[PDB]
Every structure is written in structure tokens, then in C-alpha cells.
Amino acid sequence: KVCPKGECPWQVLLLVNGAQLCGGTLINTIWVVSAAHCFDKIKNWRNLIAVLGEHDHDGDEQSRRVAQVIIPSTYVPGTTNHDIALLRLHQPVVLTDHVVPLCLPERTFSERTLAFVRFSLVSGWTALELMVLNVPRLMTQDCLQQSRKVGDSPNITEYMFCAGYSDGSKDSCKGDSGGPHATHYRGTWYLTGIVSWGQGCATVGHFGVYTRVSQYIEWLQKLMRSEPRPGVLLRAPFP
């Protein structure tokens, strides 16, 4: 296992009213990247908590209220496209042996180098680890078929990609969803995808579908440097 006990230090568990909502990825002490679809249905939420660290007594576990969630203007509930959310924590996490961010790579490096690494590491939820075989660009249009839908957003082939394969449902989809798809290169791990339609989700056999993070790098950096605004859930223009 790449990560100790299959628990990657950048993995985040998102809870609402103490119940599992989705997973996420820490990219620095204050920002977490997850999936927009995790916020499709909101009713009677008393909070939104990000949990990090060792979870499997008190040992190296940190929790943080999520101050704000930002989704792109191009995202449409129900459509498997532009599935990404940027979360700002009220207070920074403290980095430790069990809490470390995953690097958000530069766009060019991600497109020229990371996009060609054969396998990637996907983390989900207890923490789970899974090495997956990325589906080459040429086969993307075909692997995205099951995700396709009439009247949906254009260029799904550009903003989403596939990796690995799922044959049956597993009790782990909640935290799995919105979780990290990391790619290794010369000793360092980088964020390359966000679990959109993960393994262990649904009963039908399907490719794992992930949001291509390289298409959102500039957008994420723009959001992180912007002046703070009021509100807990906002739609920001994309690009």
C-alpha cells in the first residue's frame, strides 16, 4: 500500500449533521477540493465538517467547519460534467504525519506529463486505497458513454476522464465520491482527478469517471486568491 493502512494524508471526509456526505482532497492548509454533485441536495443542514487524519483514540484527527463552497457556473445538477467544488475551511488544519496536502500541479506539467502516467491512486471511504488504470485520451469518448445524457453540457470528453472499472456496488460511495485521484511523478503525488462516478457505486459495470483537474487549475487558483465574500455556497464564473 502506498499510503499507511490505506489512509492517504490528503484525504478528507465531509460530514453533514455527523453523517457521511462525500470525500475530498486537502490541497493546502485552508482549501479542500471535492465534487459539485455533493451539494445537489441540501435540506436541514446544521453544518458542514471536514475531517482529516488518523481515523482507524484521539490520535492525530482534526475537524474543521467548512466556511464556503464554490462550484463553477458551468456545472448543472444531474449532469456528469464540470463536477468540481472548492471548499474553504474557517481555520487552517495543522500539518502532521497524518495530515498533508496533495499538490495541485501546474497546468502544463499536468497536461504534458501527469496525463500520461498509466496508473493513479484513488482514495475513498474507514479509508480505502485503490490503484487504477487510466483510460487513454483516444478512448475517452467511448468510456464516457454510460455517463452521457441527452441535452447535457457540451465537451464532457474534455472536462471528464475515465480510470479503472467497477462491477458491483460497495458500501463506501459516500466518502469515495468527491475523493482524490492522485498521480505520482518522480517522488511526488499530484491531484489529477475528482471522483465523479466512483468504483463501488451503482450495480451496473462501469468505468470510474473523474473530473479532469487540469482544466480547472487556473480557475481554482483564481478563487483562492480572490477577496473573501459572504455566503456558504456560491457559483463562480468558469472560466
Partner: peptide, 15 residues
């Protein structure tokens, strides 16, 4: 730039 606010607080959030 202009962002659309969907919820002010978690307690008053509906989506």
C-alpha cells in the same frame, strides 16, 4: 467578478 450566492448560512441553505 460576480458570483451567484446560493446560500447565506448552512442553517438557511436549501438546494
Amino acid at each position: 467578478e460576480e458570483w451567484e450566492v446560493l446560500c447565506w448560512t448552512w442553517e438557511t441553505c436549501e438546494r
